[PDB]
Every structure is written in structure tokens, then in C-alpha cells.
Design a binder for these strands. Structure first.
Ligand SMILES: [Mg+2]
Ligand SMILES: [Mg+2]
Ligand SMILES: [Mg+2]
Ligand SMILES: [Mg+2]
Ligand SMILES: [Mg+2]
Ligand SMILES: [Mg+2]
Ligand SMILES: [Mg+2]
Ligand SMILES: [Mg+2]
Ligand SMILES: [Mg+2]
Ligand SMILES: [Mg+2]
Ligand SMILES: [Mg+2]
Ligand SMILES: [Mg+2]
Ligand SMILES: [Mg+2]
Ligand SMILES: [Mg+2]
Ligand SMILES: [Mg+2]
Ligand SMILES: [Mg+2]
Ligand SMILES: [Mg+2]
Ligand SMILES: [Mg+2]
Ligand SMILES: [Mg+2]
Ligand SMILES: [Mg+2]
Ligand SMILES: [Mg+2]
Ligand SMILES: [Mg+2]
Ligand SMILES: [Mg+2]
Ligand SMILES: [Mg+2]
Ligand SMILES: [Mg+2]
Ligand SMILES: [Mg+2]
Ligand SMILES: [Mg+2]
Ligand SMILES: [Mg+2]
Ligand SMILES: [Mg+2]
Ligand SMILES: [Mg+2]
Ligand SMILES: [Mg+2]
Ligand SMILES: [Mg+2]
Ligand SMILES: [Mg+2]
Ligand SMILES: [Mg+2]
Ligand SMILES: [Mg+2]
Ligand SMILES: [Mg+2]
Ligand SMILES: [Mg+2]
Ligand SMILES: [Mg+2]
Ligand SMILES: [Mg+2]
Ligand SMILES: [Mg+2]
Ligand SMILES: [Mg+2]
Ligand SMILES: [Mg+2]
Ligand SMILES: [Mg+2]
Ligand SMILES: [Mg+2]
Ligand SMILES: [Mg+2]
Ligand SMILES: [Zn+2]
Lengths: 208, 83, 138, 99, 125, 104
RNA sequence: GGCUAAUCCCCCAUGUGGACCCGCCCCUUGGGGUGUGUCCAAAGGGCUUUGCCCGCUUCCGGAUGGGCCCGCGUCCCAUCAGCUAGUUGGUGGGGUAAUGGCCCACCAAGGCGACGACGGGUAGCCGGUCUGAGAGGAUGGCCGGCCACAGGGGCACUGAGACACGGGCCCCACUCCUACGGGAGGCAGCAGUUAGGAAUCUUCCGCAAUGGGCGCAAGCCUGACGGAGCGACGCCGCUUGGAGGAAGAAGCCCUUCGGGGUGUAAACUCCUGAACCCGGGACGAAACCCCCGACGAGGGGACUGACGGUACCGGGGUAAUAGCGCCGGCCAACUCCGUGCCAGCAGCCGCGGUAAUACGGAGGGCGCGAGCGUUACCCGGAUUCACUGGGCGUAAAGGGCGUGUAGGCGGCCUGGGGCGUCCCAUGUGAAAGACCACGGCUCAACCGUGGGGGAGCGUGGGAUACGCUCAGGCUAGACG
């Protein structure tokens, strides 16, 4: 199963600030705010010039840990993106961004991607009516992604979609805070996303 | 004796047959002579039975001999309706 | 004797241009003259002309180069950077219109010999024909 | 044990003894006819030839010879007899042969 | 070669030679210890490597290394061979597998135990 | 289509049969260079109508004998041992490169 | 030894027709027609019984399946170079459904080979599969097609078809029965046992569905099949939680004793709620059959599920498995202690003889995760057998030199052919798999439908620059 384990440490190792949590990774806490250096005993000693490998390695690690997906799945997706027409880099990002868990996270139904995963898993999320509980489900353009009628009363879902009143949403999405509905308009492009990722490096990492 | 019958092509618990013309002696899933239709027993989709009666009418005209089920489907497809 | 006259001519040209000759003779042959016409048209040579030497027919091939350069070795850039025989005796090479290679992404050319006559990969691709892949120039 | 389609072997033996006999008659008479044509004996040779033809066509009636086999027999028989008779310098005295 | 020669004689395909005749192109092979010696390294090394003569089911009597800090192999031990040279001891081309048959797994091993076949310590207890 | 072949009669040493040496060219599957290659067919000659040196056409036929599956269809050009010559010499070299040796 | 039925077998007749000999015609290997001669048919059963069903006979045609023949393709060794006497061809005959030395008698003296005969080794072949940028290399397991086999060897019988896995005969080996005379067996069918091995499952359920054999039908048979069982063996999907939570607990580790790390990690609060309980409960199954109608078309009716009470749906509901490899360079991940060329590590270089990021442990860390790592084998990196794509003065590699056979290669101009080569159209290239799209299972794996491409080969038509070939001419090569 997916990672599990201290998260605001991957942030530290990856250097960049990954938002593997909600509210907190905004508070003046998310370690990168306190000790923005890798975990462990030698976290503070000088860093040696990374090898081309290290570079490509880390970049992938980063992009991947953001969507908290395994290496297996992450890899398969990549190979698919690689096989389709059109710039692999963008395409790959598009597919990762089409995961149900991600879209639920994108619509604000969940505070973090992890939380989004659990929402989907416990059938609190619905896709065009029928409920889906596969965090890996691929949302296509046109799909309406709502909260479970039954679940619409869950304190958490209330609290969340409440804070959503006001907040905007990705130009490839549309949220109806009203009926707790959301709609997948189109595949986000690389320009739409603002990930601290150098997709060129990830593509290269798999070249080797 | 050449026949018009059903060949298993679905998958475990997901049967899908190909209405087919083949010599009676072939395996049921072996080399047939010609496919002339298909059939989804569970109607998982609107189009769960196509038949191409033109061809059926031909094989029948040459001694093809339908299975009792193959015929049921061929019939349903209007293969025998003379009107 | 000359085992392969076409290869011969391509080499005379290759050798002459490496020392920057202006002209250069190659024993006359219709086929040779055919190839040469493409070389000219394609702007690889200034042109050529039938000439007589020792009473025998040759082909003055007027070579051409780029302009003088800077720093050390101000030697001109070549117009004919590369010129190599492909189809050769004891090892012939034929391609179908759909197997005609694209030399240096089109910056270069190839010279087939089809039953529609000697053509460049493009001329050939156009008339939709293949043939003996004579040489590659670029 | 005992697979009752032991009946099959039972039957086979009887069928064998049945064909076995018909084919002997055929051979015998054929020779007989041939031998006579050889002798030059016109009438009798031909006469016998007819029985031969008959038994042959009859063997092909059931599954002891059938079609071609029988056809092959008849041709080779009428073949030899004709030739042997002509060679013997004998005039075909009625019966058989579309002379 | 000229193209004509290539047509007459052609190229010769490279043949691969095994470095582990454990016959049946097998992954492992069992046998019985015959001698359970001690062997000294070569060139620049010094130590008393633990080796063992093994009579294989494959009909081969070969020498195998016994990895680990200590073992329990006697004259008729019986064990599984897995192949793996031992740079320092020419002639030694297979390792004995600890944790299989009469070859006890290393005692006290706490790290790379998958190898050395020592079960996980019951700290979880 | 019953296969039709063209070769040279390199042998009329038999009764109603002639050996026709059919030749064929083609690119080498890997080296590409065109390579010649040949074969001898024993064509049927009922009328002993063909002589050593003829360039005949062979036609695929119903078996005539073991080894005979072609019939001489028609003569293409009479006499020309220049071809037969080759064949025979190639043969002559054989009895040589065995225990001792051949010629030049 | 005796009796007896039939759709069992035989005789006569009828000859639509068909077979054979001979003749003639058209066709062209034995195709089709035609004349005389001869020759050859059949069986009955059921009834809603003067009609309808099931079946029978001869013949032509179709459809399906198949035999045989041919071109091209199909591994290693030339430390295998000569092989052959039914051997090569012929004439007549035998045999077969049929060609054929397939077999036989006579005749001729041929046939094959370095384009590798003969011999040895290895091996079922293919669609495909794995790898690779490709060319290529490796492979033929699941599934589909073909071949071959059924303890080993040989043989035929019966049949439309067999030289017949669960038919027959003989010989051989082994096993079992025997009163010793003589008998009985063959799991390379399903499951299972045992032996060998590093290693490969249930003596399961059902005939409901699909398919098959027999039957007018009802129906019977079906270890084929549809299912279930066992094994992380593979692939796909999923869980071991989610949010908050200290400039930061304890324990453990490091320290320049100031402090640093494990770590928001935990504790802890709130939230959801796999498991598990309760309720409902399936698609797969509509035909055969019956009735109306003509036993047709069509319309109506009835019977039937192993999987399964499973999937799925609804209610309730517990914070609820984590491991394995690695951290000297290649290569992502470093410190303390122990040890002292020891014990050990090791894919390669190499590391260990008192300051070891390389040995063992610990703390920390990197990688992947119900997996992780090892061993084995294939392709890759390897342009390291080089066609794409290599080389040989000194690195491995020019033959000691020549003469010359086969073979490979071939100057300039014209013409014919159009074999190579190029072009167009057409046939073939099954299905599966591969590529794309849409679709079914909550996704995916898996599967349905559709689309696209496809080397090679067959046929028809066309082009002629180059290679070829034939014919003619030339003098620059060559020779005199
Ligand atoms: Mg792409
Ligand atoms: Mg080339
Ligand atoms: Mg019976
Ligand atoms: Mg040392
Ligand atoms: Mg280790
Ligand atoms: Mg009696
Ligand atoms: Mg009867
Ligand atoms: Mg009549
Ligand atoms: Mg009669
Ligand atoms: Mg023979
Ligand atoms: Mg040859
Ligand atoms: Mg074998
Ligand atoms: Mg490569
Ligand atoms: Mg190639
Ligand atoms: Mg039969
Ligand atoms: Mg039969
Ligand atoms: Mg039978
Ligand atoms: Mg029969
Ligand atoms: Mg039978
Ligand atoms: Mg039969
Ligand atoms: Mg029968
Ligand atoms: Mg039968
Ligand atoms: Mg028979
Ligand atoms: Mg019969
Ligand atoms: Mg049988
Ligand atoms: Mg059996
Ligand atoms: Mg059944
Ligand atoms: Mg049935
Ligand atoms: Mg938490
Ligand atoms: Mg490193
Ligand atoms: Mg010690
Ligand atoms: Mg130390
Ligand atoms: Mg190490
Ligand atoms: Mg260590
Ligand atoms: Mg998984
Ligand atoms: Mg290679
Ligand atoms: Mg090369
Ligand atoms: Mg080299
Ligand atoms: Mg040297
Ligand atoms: Mg020399
Ligand atoms: Mg020569
Ligand atoms: Mg020439
Ligand atoms: Mg041509
Ligand atoms: Mg084609
Ligand atoms: Mg879908
Ligand atoms: Zn964070």
C-alpha cells in the first residue's frame, strides 16, 4: 500500500516544499519553515555536488511523492504517457492529474491528497452518479465529481467545502460549492500546473 | 458436417460467443471457417447480438446446420423471417 | 581498368575539391554526364563541359567552394561536404519509392537511377519511383 | 474391463470373411477369362468375362471394392481379354465388349 | 571481408560458455559434504576460508564456499549449492546456501539475513 | 500456374529423360548482393526430341517417375555447349579436391 | 449340434442413370460428349395411417474435410569428401481413391555432390514470444494451426475415413493371476500414488451454459467443458488510516558538552471506518419441447442453473499486517563501537595486519513495498562476428612466391529482349497476439466491437536509367 510514515520529512529531503498535508503545511510549521534540510544525523553538513543520477533521481522522487503514488503505478503511467501522441512530459502530468484522488483534492473536497485518497476509498465520492472508490480511477473530461448524498453531512466534508466558499479552482475544473459538485472540464496542461518539477529530468531518468 | 454454432470467446464469468461456421469436428474454440455474428448472453451493452443474415442465409443454403441455440439467435436476427 | 567508373568520378571530384582545384577531368560517359547534370542543378558544382584530352572525351567539372575564412586555415568551406558511392558492383543497392533515404534531413541529396531516368531522391519521390541508389551527396 | 464395443471386432471378423470370399471369386474368374482369351477360345472366354464383370460391379455394390477399384478391375480385364483374343487371331463371338 | 566473402563464409555466431556446471542448467543443486576443509586465499589475501567438497545429485563432486561467521557442516552434512565464484580461492565456483538442509543459518545475524538464512529476531515479541 | 522453368540440357544420357540445369539469381537475404544459384531437373522427353546443349523450358507436371516431375515444354534456342561446358568443368574439378587435388 | 428375425446377406427384374472395352466428335496428360456391346440399384420403420414423418437406391452438383505433387524458405561440424545398385531412367505389370521404383520382371547405365552430396550432432515446425533505435539475437511455454507418438518393434482387418491412445495379431521387456497346461495388463485422458528433482496443485462441483456422439423425440452418454480448490507463481486493483498535534516527551544514537538526530514521528484530540455482523439477492436461460398456425414464417406456453446464497445492493461497525535489499567507487544513501591480513566481505576494482563510510552491530539514511533479495538462463549494453556497423606496418590478423581452374568483378557508343530492378491493380497474408478508437466489469488487469498497417508469394498491366542478355561498332584497358 501507499507510503505512510512521516511526511514533512520527504519535504525536507526533496528540498522543495511538498504539500502532503492540509492546513498545517501552511501554518508556520511544515518543517521546511523550521529546519529546511534533509532528515537524519547529517542533515546539516555540507552537500556534495549531486551526480547526474542524483539529480534525475530526486526530480522523479519529488514529482512522484507529490501525488503520493507508488513507483509501480507511477512508472506504468509514465510508460503510457510515453506511448501516446504529444509531448510526454505534459501528457504524463495530465494523466497523474486525472487520478480521481487528485481531482477530489483539486476540488477542495479534501484538505490534502492523502485525505482525498481516503475519501474515495470510503466511498464518500461519486463520479457521474455511480460511486467510485478507486484512488487510481481516471477522471475524463466531462465527468461530474460530487460528494456522496449520504456523506454530504460529514462534519469534515462540511468543514472543507465550507472553506471552499471563496477559493477559486483550476481552469480545467469547475466547482459548485452549492451542491458539492465539481466538473472535470479538460486535461490540465503544463502551463496550468505549477509543480516544482522539471519534467525534462524525469523523462531522462527513465531514459537510462 | 459444417455447422453454424457458438464459440466461447469471453473470459471467466464474462462469456461472449462468436456465431460461427465450422466443420462439426473442430474444437469448439478451434479454427472456424467464417465468423458470421456475435452474441453477448448477458446483454452488457445494447448491441449484444449482430448476425449478418445475408451470410447466414448463404451457409444455410449450402448445408450449414445450426446448433439449437445458434438457430435461436439466427432466428431472433430475422434469418428465417420470410414474410 | 576501372572496376567502377561512377565511384571513380565521385572520387576525382572528392580529391580535387579537397585541394581546391578549379576544374577537374573525368573520362566521359553518358551516365556520368547524367549524374553531373544533377550535381550542377543542385548547385554542388559550377557546372561541367565536354572537352577533349589526348584525343579522348572527358568532362571538365567546374568545382565551387564557399568563401575565404577567418583565423588560422582560412580555407573555404566546401560546397560538397560529403559524396559517397552507395550502389557498387559485387554489391548493388535498389530501393522502392518508399525506401528512398532522406539525406541529412533533406539538406543533402541522393541520386537514384530509375527507369524514368537519373533523379534525386525528391525528383524520384515525386515521379513516385525507385531504383538503384547510386550515391549520396551533402 | 469389457467395453461392449467388442461387438465391433466381432462384426469386423464377419465382414472380413465376407469380402475375403467375394474377392477370390473375382480373381479366379478373371484369370479364368484371361486364360481362355489366351487360348483363343472366343465364346467361353467372353462368357466368363461377363461373370467377372458382374461380380466386380457387384462387389462395388457394397463396400468390398466400390467405384474406381472395380472400374480399374473391369478395364484391366476387358483390356487383357481383347488383346489376347485379337493376338490369338480370334473373332469376338458375342457377349460383352463393345466391339 | 569483402561482401563476396561474407556471402561465401558469413559471420560466426558467438557461443556462450557456462561458468557453473550445476548440470540441468539448474538454479541450485543439492549434494553431500565429503570434506569440510579450510582454505587459504591467494595473491594478496590471507585468511582461512571455509570450503567444502560436495558430491552433487548432478553427479559432480565440487568444492563450495561456506559464507557466514561460523557453520555446522560435518562430513555428511548434505546441502544446497547455488553457484558464485570466490575470487580469492581459485577453483571455488559455488556457494553453499545457509538456511537449507543441514546448513544452519548464521547465528546472531541481524542485517543482510535474507542471505545467511537467519529468521527475523523476535523483537516484535 | 504450373511452374515454367528455363535451363540448359546438360545431359541426354537417359531414355526419354533430359537433365535441365535451371539457373536463378536473387539478393542475398542479409548481404543484399545479388547471387546466382542453380538446380538440375530431370525433365521428361518422350520423343528424345531434345539434345545436349538445347535451352529448353520445363513445365511442372504430374509425376512421371520418382525424381521426374517436369516435362520439356519447348525449345528456346538450340545448341550452345558454352553453357554445358561450364557445367562439365565444374564437375571435372570435383574429382580432385578430395584426397589429392584438382587443377589450377 | 439344433431352431430363428430384420433396415443382416444373396438371386432375378426395372436402368432415370452410372461403370468398362471399342469407335467418332470437341477438348487437351486420365476433361466433356456420343453409338453399339457387356455390367450394376434399393428396406424398411412410425403414425394425429390413402397420407405425413423417419429411412433406403442410382446419378449429377454443392459444401466441408482430406491424399498426392511442385517453387522458394528452414540449426551445428568439412577434424564428415566423395555418396548411390531399386540405385537413376525406360518398357510392361502389380498396387491405390490417385500420380509415382510405391512394388515387381525385363532393359538401359545411369542419378547426387564443394550452390556441400554422404556422414555425425542437436531439434517437432509455425502464428508468435523475449530483447533490441533498428538490423539482428534468443526462443516456440500458455493459446491457435500443422506434424508425430500412445510400454518398444512389426502387421493388417473392418470401415467414407485407421494401420486405429481407452480395437485386433505377432515378437520383446516389465507387472499381475495360475492347479505350470495357460491367462491378464499399459494414465503421453481427469484426479491421484510413487520415483527422480532446486521445483510444478484437488483421488473437488456440475452437465445449468457452449460444443460433441446416438435418437422422430423425450432423453442418454460427455474428467470436452463451465466452475470451485491449492501455490504472492505472474499481472492488475486495494488496505495497514485521515486532519490536527512542541522551536519540540521518553528511550536509543551522535557531540567540539553549547547542542544535534530519530520527529509530527509518538503520546494525545477529533474524523472516516477494511475486517466482521444483519437484511435483500442476480445476470449468465431460452431454446429443444407443447399449443395455435401447414411439423414452415410467425405467435403463445412450459422446464432448466454447478458456480452461490457467491457478485452486487442496503443497514450496522472495529484505527485495524510491514517487510526486504542496500549506504567505498560504478550507485541514491555516514557516523559510533567492536574487530586487528583475524573473523570476514567480494559483481569488478578491491577492503581487513589498532582513526576501516568496504568486515559485525548499532544510530541514521537511500531504494522498493506484500513484497524484497539471491541463484539460473535469454536479449541488451557489445560497432566484442561489425548487413546496418570492425579490422590486419609495430596491438590478434597478409597466405613464403608464383602459375592458374571454378567463382566474384568488368572500358566507350548504338539497337533488340525485359531476367535482376522500379511502378500500378488484384489474390493471399485465419483467429489469437501487436497498433488505434469506442465500449463491458466501480478502475485496472482481463474482455467485446470496430478501424489501421503488414513482409513474402501468385496473377494482370507498364517503365528501361542501372545490372543482365543478345546483336553491332569503337580504341583510352590488354595483348602483338
Ligand atoms: Mg509521448
Ligand atoms: Mg546499403
Ligand atoms: Mg452397438
Ligand atoms: Mg588483503
Ligand atoms: Mg553485506
Ligand atoms: Mg450351428
Ligand atoms: Mg443391405
Ligand atoms: Mg437412358
Ligand atoms: Mg440387376
Ligand atoms: Mg525405390
Ligand atoms: Mg544448387
Ligand atoms: Mg527430442
Ligand atoms: Mg544494439
Ligand atoms: Mg538487413
Ligand atoms: Mg470407414
Ligand atoms: Mg469408419
Ligand atoms: Mg465405421
Ligand atoms: Mg464407411
Ligand atoms: Mg468402424
Ligand atoms: Mg465410417
Ligand atoms: Mg461407415
Ligand atoms: Mg462408419
Ligand atoms: Mg476397406
Ligand atoms: Mg459406409
Ligand atoms: Mg481408438
Ligand atoms: Mg489409457
Ligand atoms: Mg452438457
Ligand atoms: Mg448439448
Ligand atoms: Mg497523522
Ligand atoms: Mg553516492
Ligand atoms: Mg577473530
Ligand atoms: Mg576502528
Ligand atoms: Mg558495501
Ligand atoms: Mg559496515
Ligand atoms: Mg500490488
Ligand atoms: Mg551485436
Ligand atoms: Mg562491415
Ligand atoms: Mg577490432
Ligand atoms: Mg602481430
Ligand atoms: Mg608477403
Ligand atoms: Mg576467370
Ligand atoms: Mg558494363
Ligand atoms: Mg522484368
Ligand atoms: Mg500484395
Ligand atoms: Mg470503461
Ligand atoms: Zn510539509
Amino acid at each position: 500500500g501507499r507510503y505512510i510514515g512521516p511526511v514533512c520529512r520527504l519535504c525536507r529531503r526533496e528540498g522543495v516544499k511538498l504539500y502532503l498535508k492540509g492546513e498545517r503545511c501552511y501554518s508556520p510549521k511544515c518543517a521546511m519553515e523550521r529546519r529546511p534540510y534533509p532528515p537524519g544525523q547529517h542533515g546539516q553538513k555540507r552537500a556534495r555536488r549531486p551526480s547526474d543520477y542524483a539529480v534525475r533521481l530526486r526530480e522523479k522522487q519529488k514529482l512522484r511523492r507529490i501525488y503520493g503514488i507508488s513507483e509501480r503505478q507511477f512508472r506504468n503511467l509514465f510508460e503510457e504517457a510515453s506511448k501516446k501522441k504529444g509531448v510526454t512530459g505534459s501528457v504524463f502530468l495530465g494523466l497523474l492529474e486525472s487520478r480521481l484522488d487528485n481531482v477530489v483534492y483539486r476540488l477542495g473536497f479534501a484538505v490534502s491528497r492523502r485525505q482525498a485518497r481516503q475519501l474515495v476509498r470510503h466511498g464518500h465520492i461519486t463520479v457521474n452518479g455511480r460511486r467510485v472508490d478507486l484512488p487510481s480511477y481516471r477522471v475524463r473530461p466531462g465527468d461530474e465529481i460530487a460528494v456522496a448524498e449520504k456523506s454530504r453531512n460529514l462534519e469534515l466534508i462540511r468543514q472543507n467545502l465550507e472553506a471552499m466558499k471563496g477559493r477559486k479552482v483550476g481552469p480545467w475544473l469547475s466547482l459548485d460549492v452549492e451542491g458539492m459538485k465539481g466538473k472535470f472540464l479538460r486535461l490540465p496542461d503544463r502551463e496550468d500546473l505549477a509543480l516544482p518539477v522539471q519534467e525534462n529530468l524525469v523523462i531522462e531518468f527513465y531514459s537510462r | 458436417m459444417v455447422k453454424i454454432r457458438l464459440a466461447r470467446f469471453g473470459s471467466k464469468h464474462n462469456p461472449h460467443y462468436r456465431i460461427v461456421v465450422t466443420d462439426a469436428r473442430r474444437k469448439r474454440d478451434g479454427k472456424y471457417i467464417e465468423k458470421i455474428g456475435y452474441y453477448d448472453p448477458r446483454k452488457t451493452t445494447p448491441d449484444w447480438l449482430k448476425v449478418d443474415v445475408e451470410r447466414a442465409r448463404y451457409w444455410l443454403s449450402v448445408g450449414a446446420q445450426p446448433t439449437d441455440t445458434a438457430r435461436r439467435l439466427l432466428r431472433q436476427a430475422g434469418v428465417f423471417r420470410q414474410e | 581498368m576501372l572496376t567502377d567508373p561512377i565511384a571513380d568520378m565521385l572520387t576525382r571530384i572528392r580529391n580535387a575539391t579537397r585541394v581546391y582545384k578549379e576544374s577537374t577531368d573525368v573520362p566521359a560517359s553518358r551516365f556520368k554526364e547524367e549524374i553531373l547534370r544533377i550535381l550542377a542543378r543542385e548547385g554542388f558544382i559550377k557546372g561541367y563541359e565536354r572537352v577533349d584530352v589526348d584525343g579522348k572525351p572527358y568532362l571538365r567539372v567546374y568545382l565551387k567552394y564557399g568563401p575565404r575564412r577567418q583565423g588560422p586555415d582560412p580555407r573555404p568551406e566546401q560546397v560538397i561536404h560529403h559524396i559517397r558511392r552507395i550502389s557498387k558492383p559485387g554489391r548493388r543497392v535498389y530501393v522502392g519509392v518508399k525506401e528512398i533515404p532522406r539525406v541529412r534531413r533533406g539538406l543533402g541529396i541522393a541520386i537514384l537511377s530509375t527507369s524514368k531516368g537519373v533523379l534525386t531522391d525528391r525528383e524520384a519521390r515525386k515521379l513516385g519511383v525507385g531504383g538503384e541508389l547510386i550515391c549520396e551527396v551533402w | 474391463r469389457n467395453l461392449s464395443a467388442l461387438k465391433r471386432h466381432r462384426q469386423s471378423l464377419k465382414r472380413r470373411l465376407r469380402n475375403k470370399a467375394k474377392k477370390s471369386a473375382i480373381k479366379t474368374l478373371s484369370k479364368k477369362a484371361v486364360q481362355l482369351a489366351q487360348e483363343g477360345k472366343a465364346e467361353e472366354a467372353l462368357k466368363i468375362m461377363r461373370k467377372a464383370e458382374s461380380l466386380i460391379d457387384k462387389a462395388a455394390k457394397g463396400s468390398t471394392l466400390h467405384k474406381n477399384a472395380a472400374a480399374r478391375r473391369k478395364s484391366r480385364l476387358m483390356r487383357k481379354v481383347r488383346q489376347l483374343l485379337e493376338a490369338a487371331g480370334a473373332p469376338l463371338i458375342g457377349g460383352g465388349l463393345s466391339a | 571481408p569483402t561482401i563476396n566473402q561474407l556471402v561465401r563464409k558469413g559471420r560466426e555466431k558467438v557461443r556462450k560458455k557456462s561458468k557453473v556446471p550445476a548440470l540441468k542448467g539448474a538454479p541450485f543443486r543439492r549434494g553431500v559434504c565429503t570434506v569440510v576443509r579450510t582454505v587459504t586465499p591467494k595473491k594478496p589475501n590471507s585468511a582461512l576460508r571455509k570450503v567444502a567438497k560436495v558430491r552433487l545429485t548432478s553427479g559432480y563432486e565440487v568444492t563450495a564456499y561456506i559464507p557466514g561467521e561460523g557453520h555446522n557442516l560435518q562430513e555428511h552434512s548434505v546441502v544446497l549449492i547455488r553457484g558464485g565464484r570466490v575470487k580469492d580461492l581459485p577453483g571455488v565456483r559455488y556457494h553453499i546456501v545457509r538456511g537449507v538442509y543441514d546448513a544452519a543459518g548464521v547465528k546472531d545475524r541481524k542485517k543482510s539475513r535474507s542471505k545467511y538464512g537467519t529468521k527475523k529476531p523476535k523483537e516484535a515479541a | 500456374p504450373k511452374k515454367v522453368l528455363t535451363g540448359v540440357v546438360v545431359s541426354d544420357k537417359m531414355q526419354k529423360t533430359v537433365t535441365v540445369l535451371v539457373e536463378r539469381q536473387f539478393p542475398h537475404p542479409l548481404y543484399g548482393k545479388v547471387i546466382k544459384r542453380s538446380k538440375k531437373y530431370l525433365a521428361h522427353d518422350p520423343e528424345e526430341k531434345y539434345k545436349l546443349g538445347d535451352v529448353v523450358e520445363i513445365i511442372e507436371s504430374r509425376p512421371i517417375s520418382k525424381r521426374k516431375r517436369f516435362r520439356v515444354l519447348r525449345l528456346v534456342e538450340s545448341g550452345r555447349m558454352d553453357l554445358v561446358e561450364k557445367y562439365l568443368i565444374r564437375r571435372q574439378n570435383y574429382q580432385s579436391l578430395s584426397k589429392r587435388g584438382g587443377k589450377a
